[PDB]
Each structure stands twice: as structure tokens, then as C-alpha cells.
Amino acid sequence: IFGTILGFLKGL
């Protein structure tokens, strides 16, 4: 993933 922090917002 390109940015776990950002992805977390949406989920996975």
C-alpha cells in the first residue's frame, strides 16, 4: 500500500 496511514482512513 502507498501510505498505510492514509489507507487506514478507508480501511485496507
Q: Quick one: cell of 6?
A: 492514509
**Distance (Å, rounded) from C-alpha 8 to C-alpha 1?**
10
Cα angle 12, 9, 5; round to 5: 80
Experimental method: NMR
**Cα-flanking dihedrals φ and ψ of residue 7, to 5°?**
-55, -35
Tell me if 7 sits within 8 A of 1, measured CB to CB. yes
- Vertex 11, ends 5 and 12: CA angle to 5°? 85
Q: Which amino acid is at 5?
A: I
- Residue 11 zone, left/alpha/beta (φ > 0; ψ -120 to 50; rest): left
As a whole number of angstroms, the distance between CA 8 and CA 3 comes to 8
Question: How far is CA 9 from each of CA 1, 2, 4, rounded to the nearest angstrom?
Answer: 13, 13, 9
DSSP state at residue 11:
-
Expressed in angstroms, the distance from the first to the final Cα of the chain is 9
